[PDB]
Amino acid sequence: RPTFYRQELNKTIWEVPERYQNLSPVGSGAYGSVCAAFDTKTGHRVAVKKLSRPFQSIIHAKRTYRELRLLKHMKHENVIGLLDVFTPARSLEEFNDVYLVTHLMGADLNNIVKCQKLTDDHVQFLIYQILRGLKYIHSADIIHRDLKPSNLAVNEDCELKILDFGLARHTDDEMTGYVATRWYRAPEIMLNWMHYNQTVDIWSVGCIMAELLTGRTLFPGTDHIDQLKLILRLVGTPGAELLKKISSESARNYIQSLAQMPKMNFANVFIGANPLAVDLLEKMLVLDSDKRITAAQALAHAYFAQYHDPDDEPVADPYDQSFESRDLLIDEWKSLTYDEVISFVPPP
Ligand SMILES: NC(=O)c1ccccc1Nc1ccc(Cl)cc1
Ligand SMILES: [Cl-]
Ligand SMILES: [Cl-]
Ligand SMILES: [Cl-]
Ligand SMILES: [Cl-]
Ligand SMILES: [Cl-]
Ligand SMILES: [Mg+2]
């Protein structure tokens, strides 16, 4: 067991191993508080996140367990990984606080799309990395659910990591009105017409790629209905074959109220783009999720010919998510989480 030291920074008690020095507050949300620190064991600058109220309800206790399991599993160059997890507790009986440690991130993709002149080669490399990371995540039957520019970390060498997985956190208020939180979502999930599946992440990559090519948001709707009208004007209205797949009677009656529109010519929308970029966008931005290109299929598209290496695009170890259908008490979720804290083995 390491030696811990205690201090108060910005109205919060931090109790951490001596290895973490020069702690400085960097933000806080509903989920926890974050400090930047220097890790003397590894030599890296790190983010230390102290969870808030991790075991306050059954919902909160299960969310805590879900996040720790997902971060412990992810071991890939283009996905955030877990450097450390700790608690100052000496036993299950006094266990209350959980701290998570990751590499400290600088710029996100928002910064570089707003401020930088991007070549076609930059767009090829950035979208290649997102798809390499997604091939890995989807091979474990994990859905990200919240891919958007603010959840993609980028450095000065254009190297990219996926972070901030959807832990089913977002609320109704958060998705309402003129908000970036909804602009990257597939239209069948934002109107709650289909159960989530891994094809929803490929719609989000289409929206991100369009915005790197034009420097503008593809579907900046003022509310759910405005956003659906922007989507259908570009890709056209649902065909009868797609209508057949919708369960809700009330969903079908609404779609059927709209005038029919054809799919637009994407070369006349993305004016001057690489023809191979236009072809890949037409394969991602498909209304019927069964017909969208997969991450593994996209990596072999001719747009990525200069980066594609089928011997260096790894898949994940198998991931057991059977806990998601399990009904437990707060103290049972808390015991499972304690075992995952004490069994953690750091990377090389
Ligand atoms: N297969 C699907 O993709 C799907 C399945 C069930 C329910 C909805 C669906 N997709 C959808 C329907 C209508 C519209 Cl406008 C946009 C996407
Ligand atoms: Cl230490
Ligand atoms: Cl990492
Ligand atoms: Cl504790
Ligand atoms: Cl964003
Ligand atoms: Cl597993
Ligand atoms: Mg985020």
Counting atoms of ligand 1 from 1, which one is nearest the CA of 237?
A: 15
φ, ψ (nearest 5 deg) of residue 125: -70, -45
Whose CA is closest to 198, among 184, 183, 186, 180?
186
- C-alpha distances in Å from residue 267, one per residue of 125, 211, 233, 275, 277: 21, 15, 15, 8, 10
Where does 38-157 have alpha helices with state H? 58-73, 109-115, 120-139
In DSSP terms, which residues pair with 79 in a beta bridge?
162
Exposure letters 178-198 (e unless 16+ CB within 10 A, then b): eeeebbbbbbbbbbebbeeeb
DSSP classification of residue 219: -
- C-alpha distances in Å from residue 134, one per residue of 69, 131, 137, 153: 18, 5, 5, 15
Q: Is 31 assigned to a binding site?
A: yes
Counting atoms of ligand 1 from 1, which one is nearest the CA of 232?
A: 15
Counting atoms of ligand 1 from 1, which one is nearest the CA of 228?
A: 15
Q: At the fourth CATH level, which superfamily is domain 109-304?
A: Transferase(Phosphotransferase) domain 1 (1.10.510.10)
Whose structure tokens read 């089913």?
168
Q: Residue 1 and residue 6: Cα distance in Å, rounded?
A: 16
* Experimental technique of record: X-ray
Q: Residue 191 and residue 200: Cα distance in Å, rounded?
A: 13
Residues with CB under 6 A from ligand 1: 187-188, 193-194, 238, 242, 245-246, 255, 287-290
Cα within 13 Å of Cα(229), Cβ side: 9
Q: Residue 66 and residue 169: Cα distance in Å, rounded?
A: 12
Helix (H, G, I), strand (E, B) or coil at 168: coil
Q: Residue 55 and residue 143: Cα distance in Å, rounded?
A: 25
- C-alpha distances in Å from residue 9, one per residue of 17, 22, 205: 16, 11, 39
Helix (H, G, I), strand (E, B) or coil at 280: helix
> 26, 46 in Cβ contact below 8 A?
no
Q: Is 30 assigned to a binding site?
A: yes
In DSSP terms, which residues pair with 28 in a beta bridge?
33
Q: Which amino acid is at 309?
A: D
> 194, 231 in Cβ contact below 8 A?
no
Q: How far is the CA of 216 from the centre of ligand 3 (A)?
A: 29
Q: Residue 231 and residue 182: Cα distance in Å, rounded?
A: 13
Q: Residue 310 and residue 161: Cα distance in Å, rounded?
A: 20
Strands (E) across 104-237 are located at: 152-154, 160-162
Q: How far is the CA of 74 from the centre of ligand 4 (A)?
A: 25
Which of 224, 246, 257, 285 most suits a substitution to test ligand 1, by most atoms within 8 Å of the C-beta?
A: 246
Q: Is 235 assigned to a binding site?
A: no
Whose structure tokens read 């958060």?
174
Among all bound ligands, the one having the nearest atom to the CA of 244 is 1
Q: Residue 172 and residue 51: Cα distance in Å, rounded?
A: 23
φ, ψ (nearest 5 deg) of residue 298: -60, -40
Give the number of other Cβ atoms within 10 Å of residue 21's Cβ: 11
The residue contributing the CA closest to ligand 1 atom 14 is: 188
Helix (H, G, I), strand (E, B) or coil at 15: strand
Whose CA is closest to 104, among 170, 63, 43?
43
Q: Residue 215 and residue 33: Cα distance in Å, rounded?
A: 32
Which of 197, 227, 257, 289 most suits a substitution to test ligand 1, by most atoms within 8 Å of the C-beta?
A: 289
> 228, 237 in Cβ contact below 8 A?
no
